[PDB]
Amino acid sequence: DVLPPEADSSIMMLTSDQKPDVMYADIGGMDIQKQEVREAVELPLTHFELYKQIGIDPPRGVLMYGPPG
Amino acid sequence: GADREVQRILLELLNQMDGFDQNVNVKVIMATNRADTLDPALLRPGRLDRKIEFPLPDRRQKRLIFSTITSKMNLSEEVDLEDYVARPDKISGADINSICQESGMLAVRENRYIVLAKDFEKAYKTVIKKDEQEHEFYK
Amino acid sequence: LLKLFTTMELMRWSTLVEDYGMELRPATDVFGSTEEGEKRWKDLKNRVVEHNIRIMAKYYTRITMKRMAQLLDLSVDESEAFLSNLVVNKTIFAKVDRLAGIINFQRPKDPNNLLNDWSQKLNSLMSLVNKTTHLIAKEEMIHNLQ
Amino acid sequence: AEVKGVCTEAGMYALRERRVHVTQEDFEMAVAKVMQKDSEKNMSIKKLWK
Amino acid sequence: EGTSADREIQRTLMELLNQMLHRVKMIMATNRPDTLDPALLRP
Amino acid sequence: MQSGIIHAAEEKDWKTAYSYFYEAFEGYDSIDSPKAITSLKYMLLCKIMLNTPEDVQALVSGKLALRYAGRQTEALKCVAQASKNRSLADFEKALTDYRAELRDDPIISTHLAKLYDNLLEQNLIRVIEPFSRVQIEHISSLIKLSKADVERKLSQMIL
Amino acid sequence: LQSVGQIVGEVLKQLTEEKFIVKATNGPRYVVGCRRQLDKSKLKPGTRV
Prior knowledge:
Chain D: It is found in: Cytoplasm; Nucleus. This is part of a larger assembly, with two copies of chain A, one copy of chain C, one copy of chain D, two copies of chain E and one copy of chain F. By secondary structure, chain A is mainly α. Helix content of chain A is 32%, strand content 6%.
């Protein structure tokens, strides 16, 4: 029997245990950054039809840079 | 040798992010404290098409952060967070959290669950940590 | 007193006060009547009421509000308020038909649960009869040897 | 790649207003956003070379 | 643009910085705060 | 002030809405312009809508928000106390008493009406949970409203 | 006399509730079953076995 692909990956995703306990609301302001990241990695995965109907490749990939803290 | 191995790691990352075998639904997020040193090829719209900046909090963001942190926290009626917010400094979110946290511990040691303006003023000084003794001829 | 509060039976507050009011007539708290901060007498009354609620919820399915009040030694409206507070706190489950005062502790009966209970009764019956036939086989299979 | 990013960002701006449009305003703003050149502003290091 | 060893040391710092979550308190000891990375000194 | 209004109306980001309203209030106070009491009212409204009425009195007793004291802040104080006590009757009493301030001003009247409806919904749920069959008269007596209004609200909720 | 040593390995993936992909260190990787008295929840990738 063939096992599921990438079994023995050696790289583990986030199980229910890790699941960082942080909200979108437990972050002061940062409306611009939240919107940009959400459009990058949340809206395409939640409502993809919205992007497709406009005819766009969702902006996969995003860099976050700034002074520490 | 070792720096070439690091360069090969970088090249493999570039090639996997955007190469011959195009990916789908593999959105990638990466964070760094210094965006200038990064390779110019791993900054190319198609691999990193956002380049979001996270500047130090402005006055308004300072106010929002202070509200969000001072929530879930008993607070004295005589406190004026407006003064701390307006006082122009370079305080970041982490050090704002530290201000609130050490004000809390100062109050605990002072045997009190409701922090006063003296307690904050102490915390604000101890977080600003204004460096001094700068050899004065530079000015 | 401790025996009554550990036994599974309703104890009327009127009888308990005509029995064990000696407290402060002895000990240092729950005063029969005293300074305000130590007239916890009302807290003890509430504890008696709560114990009665627990016993009734354990040993009833449909208790009329009139009977519940006259058994708990509180007005109908007072008992209604106490039961509503308990329900909101989630300590007790009880659905109150105030149109006819038909307080009911019967949780909604899923057909799955009803048939599962029936099947469990059947399984227990079959196991019991099997064990009884084994024991009776031994019984007759020894005595008839005599 | 920068041109493709320009198109993507113009589409993103259109999406921002739950729209299906694209216009010169959105395209120009997308160009400005995508080609964010980090220059030098002391003006002395800049004017060293006449 | 330090040397290869310097960049390796910076990478080791960077790993420590990121890994540095529950009931694991930490004490540092040093004779110099000048060299310390601003991020590593972050509150 | 306009940005605060938009944030309050659209995305329910009342924290940012209050931030912008406070910025507008500081600007108008510095100018000494009459259009600062409106910003103060909107800041208090944001504080109430944040489900933290306790801070409204603290903000009113502020360093800058004293020259404008009067009926304008008294109305918000009354609304805050009514919300904190969850008294729908007292809420409506304050609304009718300060109709001049709380009502006739759309940007605040609409939000206060929505808050009233939400509080009525929550109170109805709380008072109806400990039951399985109730008299609308009994519920109305418990909640301190009128039979017709409670009936219409219940019908809307059920629908 | 009546004891025998086991084989030390490390889980690699919690497959179907009974199947665990375990890599025997310095050896191959099997799919194995879990005996009765054990905490499947306790068993997580990287745990020794």
